[PDB]
Amino acid sequence: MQLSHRPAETGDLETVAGFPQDRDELFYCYPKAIWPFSVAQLAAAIAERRGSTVAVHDGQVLGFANFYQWQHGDFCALGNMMVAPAARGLGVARYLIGVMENLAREQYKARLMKISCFNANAAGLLLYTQLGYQPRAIAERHDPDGRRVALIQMDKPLE
């Protein structure tokens, strides 16, 4: 793996919008979105958020993330963390989270990164645990079927 990163561009939107494979995946990474995902929904998130970044390997956009929240001198919250299905388990999200942590420190002087994860998303919970995030609270949310789910709020000091 020879990963690089850059800010997201318009031309990346169709590829990134293709990443969520089912309603569950979309809900995990973008719970306010509606299935099917679309480039217009992705572009609306980008416009509302900060720090939209892609990860690239061998000429392919394989990952995307942004900041859900940003508070100068305080914290950022990671959002919209998505990886291309063919490139899952290869370190793309680990790489991009490291990039985003640097960006939070450098641009926002953040002391902390917040990352929330839905309970069903075992891969995510284990990912963030691996990266040094600790659980802090659990909030009730509802999925598109009106069923109760648990949102696990985690954080990590940035140093």
Q: What is the dihedral of CA 20, 91, 132, 157, to 10 degrees?
A: -80
**Which residues share a beta bridge with 73?**
none
Task: Determine the interface stretch with ligand COA among 4-12, 79-87, 134-142, 144-152 (rule: CB under 6 A).
Answer: 79-87
Asked if residues 138 and 21 have their Cβ atoms less than 8 Å apart, the reply is no
Would you count residue 151 as binding ligand 1VP (CB under 6 A)?
yes
> What is the three-state SS of 125-151?
HHHHHHCCCEEEEEEEEECCCCCEEEE
Residue 94 marked ligand-binding: yes
Other beta carbons within 10 angstroms of residue 147's beta carbon come to: 8
Residue 29 marked ligand-binding: yes
Would you count residue 88 as binding ligand COA (CB under 6 A)?
yes
Task: Determine the interface stretch with ligand COA among 21-29, 39-47, 103-111, 140-148 (rule: CB under 6 A).
Answer: 21-29
What residues line the site for ligand 1VP (CB under 6 A)? 28-32, 68, 77-81, 115-117, 141-142, 151
Binding residues for CoA: 29, 81, 83, 89, 91, 93-94, 121, 130
